[PDB]
Amino acid sequence: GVSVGKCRGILNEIKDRNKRDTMVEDLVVLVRGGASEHITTLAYQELPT
Amino acid sequence: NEKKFIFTRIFTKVQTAHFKMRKDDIMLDEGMLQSLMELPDQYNYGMYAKF
Numbered sequence: 001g002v003s004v005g006k007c008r009g010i011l012n013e014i015k016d017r018n019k020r021d022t023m024v025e026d027l028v029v030l031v032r033g034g035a036s037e038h039i040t041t042l043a044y045q046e047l048p049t
Numbered sequence: 050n051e052k053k054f055i056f057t058r059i060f061t062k063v064q065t066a067h068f069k070m071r072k073d074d075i076m077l078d079e080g081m082l083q084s085l086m087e088l089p090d091q092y093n094y095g096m097y098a099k100f
Contacts, residue, residue, distance in 0.1 A: 035065055043063060 027045050042049075077085075084100050 035063055040063060043061065045059060045061065 029043065029045070031039055031043070033039075088096055088100065
């Protein structure tokens with residue numbers, strides 16, 4: 001009597017993830033005339049008006 | 050790996066008025082005029098450095 005056996009197994013797993021985000025903003029103002037307190041109030045870069 | 054660099058700088062200049070200095074017939078201060086008169090014609094590092 002002769003008995004023989006063979007077994008084999010393999011597992012492969014690869015994972016990849018990429019994330020890229022970009023955002024910019026720019027502002028240019030050019031005001032001529034009446035450089036008093038009110039135009040400094042209007043010189044507020046965040047609010048548009 | 051995550052990297053987030055953000056530099057948001059603002060340089061704002063509001064000019065009140067401009068000034069322009071005259072080029073000819075400039076009247077110097079009396080102190081500066083005295084200091085100039087107090088300088089010898091011979092090269093002297095001490096007095097010139099003081100001035």
